[PDB]
Ligand binder design. Structure first.
Ligand SMILES: NC(=O)c1ccc[n+]([C@@H]2O[C@H](COP(=O)([O-])OP(=O)(O)OC[C@H]3O[C@@H](n4cnc5c(N)ncnc54)[C@H](OP(=O)(O)O)[C@@H]3O)[C@@H](O)[C@H]2O)c1
Ligand SMILES: NC(=O)c1ccc[n+]([C@@H]2O[C@H](COP(=O)([O-])OP(=O)(O)OC[C@H]3O[C@@H](n4cnc5c(N)ncnc54)[C@H](OP(=O)(O)O)[C@@H]3O)[C@@H](O)[C@H]2O)c1
Ligand SMILES: Cc1cc(C(=O)N[C@@H](CCC(=O)O)C(=O)O)ccc1NC(=O)Nc1c(N)nc(N)[nH]c1=O
Ligand SMILES: Cc1cc(C(=O)N[C@@H](CCC(=O)O)C(=O)O)ccc1NC(=O)Nc1c(N)nc(N)[nH]c1=O
Lengths: 286, 287
């Protein structure tokens, strides 16, 4: 049986450190506070939940987090007015657009995301920050929050990354593709799989490190797991109960470390966003 | 043995089609002509060689190509002034900075590259264009010219890329990393290897498609190659004797279904893809 990576506990420790930094930073600079804005389009239930968990974390730490919720009938030009304003408001240190946009109109997601000023792009979703991470310029960019949090979970095992084979299942803009880049520049040998991969089971079996971000409940079976692998499950699926993308019961028998769902990647995602927000607040003080 | 992917023949076909494309544009819009600029820092022989090949190809196609060469002792502020001037000259449609910079002073390559207007970044080296490619937004960016040319060589086989396991050995900003992205958004399963990869022979043996860009002459031995693999050798290594690639061509040819020779493989495809990107930005400028 694998040792469980306790993300709920690990994040708690991170947020305490962030609170101390924000507490300390509010003294060294009186009247100053990190400010986060979260923009939402539409009213998805899962977007509501995740945004509120983020507001909740920001509250604990002392970050001032605003939530602007736009209606489903919002146009692309309406959204761009808000991004423009947030870019220009010098009191706002970071902001993000919760994805996907839930609009009945046609909105170019990529156009919206890429209007965000890169120095405020705490979610790391602009092409500018993605291109730096994709090319190995890691100390110059915001890195996406779920990948940042998966990397921290992997170090918690103590097992070095350099020279191990990492398999990443999924290549989405927010998780899988930046996760590949993060592991690579941490000097793993990385294979990316996706919905056109043949023999996915045999590919998954190659992974000393396995990160699954597919959105298909429990599709990655435990038999597929290389014995002793570090298994990281990014899935959160509501099913007949909350399950991940990895069949947790079987995989725990093969993994050496595993993240449970919930309480694994999820809280780490939120903690890493808070960390990037404090980092941009500090960078702003220069 | 493998069929030879003959880059000389394929590049010559692309240049001719480009030439006719330029001719028709010039007929449709009299006086107009695609304009490329190449900036160099220092006096490296290999850069001199490669830039000259690009000048010759542009001249054949009808691209007006200017070459600006700065001394080994230039400052970053001097280089930034030229990049700004090229960004601002409306008669220049694309330009590149031949890499590596050859300087006595330390110059931030990333700062220099990233000052290029993305719409003129025909080499696809700005962070903006890399981020578009890395995330599959392929319709808005210039792709770097060597990965573009590898993709054409692979498509010359007529074997679809989707579903195959591709291995890219090397992760540089100009070749290896963009090659991984190009193959991923053509729906390969991609493994990227580098100098920290253990058991490189076993990773190479997974490749239905193998792209090697290491600058380590003949380091990828032919016995590692999966039988039937498509082998793409981006290496141009001058060894004592002669040019060799990054793959042991002798044993590799016995196992691959297709293979690029060195020279006459990727090299001419690189130049041709740069010309294609230049013609493309010129057309976009007309819009
Ligand atoms: C975050 O994800 P999202 O919101 O982007 O959800 P999504 O559209 O389903 O994509 C999630 C990621 O998982 C991949 N995926 C879906 N089904 C898969 C399967 N059966 N085997 C392997 N990979 C699979 C998708 O591959 P594709 O990128 O090939 O759609 C995608 O990259
Ligand atoms: C031209 O174009 C080609 C590519 O040159 P470049 O611009 O990519 O130069 P570069 O910046 O030297 O890149 C070389 C790449 O090859 C990798 N590499 C070196 N030795 C290796 C080994 N033993 N095993 C696996 N990977 C190894 C390096 O790994 P690291 O990233 O770990 O250094 C790096 O990613 C060359 O063949 C040259 O002739
Ligand atoms: C999937 C997820 C889970 C949780 C979480 O907290 N999960 C807990 C249970 C929480 C509870 O119910 O208390 C657990 O799994 O244990 C927080 C965040 C996300 N994901 C995102 O927010 N993704 C995302 C996006 N869609 N768009 C942009 N722009 N940026 C983003 O990062
Ligand atoms: C390695 C190489 C070879 C040749 C070549 O001429 N090869 C043929 C001969 C016949 C012919 O080319 O027509 C052969 O090998 O057979 C052309 C180009 C390169 N490489 C680059 O130029 N790399 C590069 C760089 N260093 N910096 C920036 N910014 N952009 C870049 O693309």
């Amino acid at each position: 049986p694998a040792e469980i990576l306790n993300g709920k506990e690990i994040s708690a420790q991170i947020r305490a450190r962030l609170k101390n930094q924000v507490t300390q930073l509010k003294e060294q600079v009186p009247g100053f506070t990190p400010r986060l804005a979260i923009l939402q389009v539409g009213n998805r239930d899962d977007s509501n939940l995740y945004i509120n968990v983020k507001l909740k974390a920001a509250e604990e730490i002392g970050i001032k987090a605003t939530h602007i919720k736009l209606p489903r009938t919002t146009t692309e030009s309406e959204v761009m007015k808000y991004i423009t304003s947030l870019n220009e408001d010098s009191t706002v240190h970071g902001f993000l657009v919760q994805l996907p946009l839930d609009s009945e109109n046609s909105i170019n997601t990529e156009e919206v995301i890429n209007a965000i000023a890169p120095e405020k792009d705490v979610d790391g979703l602009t092409s500018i920050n993605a291109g730096r991470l994709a090319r190995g310029d890691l100390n110059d960019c915001f890195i996406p929050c779920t990948p940042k949090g998966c990397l921290e979970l992997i170090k918690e095992t103590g097992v070095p990354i350099a020279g191990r084979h990492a398999v990443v299942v999924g290549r989405s803009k927010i998780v899988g593709a930046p996760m590949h880049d993060l592991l690579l520049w941490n000097n793993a040998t990385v294979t990316t799989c996706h919905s056109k991969t043949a023999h996915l089971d045999e590919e998954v079996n190659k992974g000393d490190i396995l990160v699954v971000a597919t959105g298909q409940p429990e599709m990655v079976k435990g038999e597929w797991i290389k014995p002793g692998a570090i298994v990281i499950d990014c899935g959160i699926n509501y099913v007949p109960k909350v399950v991940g993308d990895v069949a947790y019961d079987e995989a725990k028998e093969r993994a050496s470390f595993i993240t449970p769902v919930p309480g694994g990647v999820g809280p780490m995602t939120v903690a890493m966003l808070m960390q990037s927000t404090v980092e941009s607040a500090k960078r702003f003080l220069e």
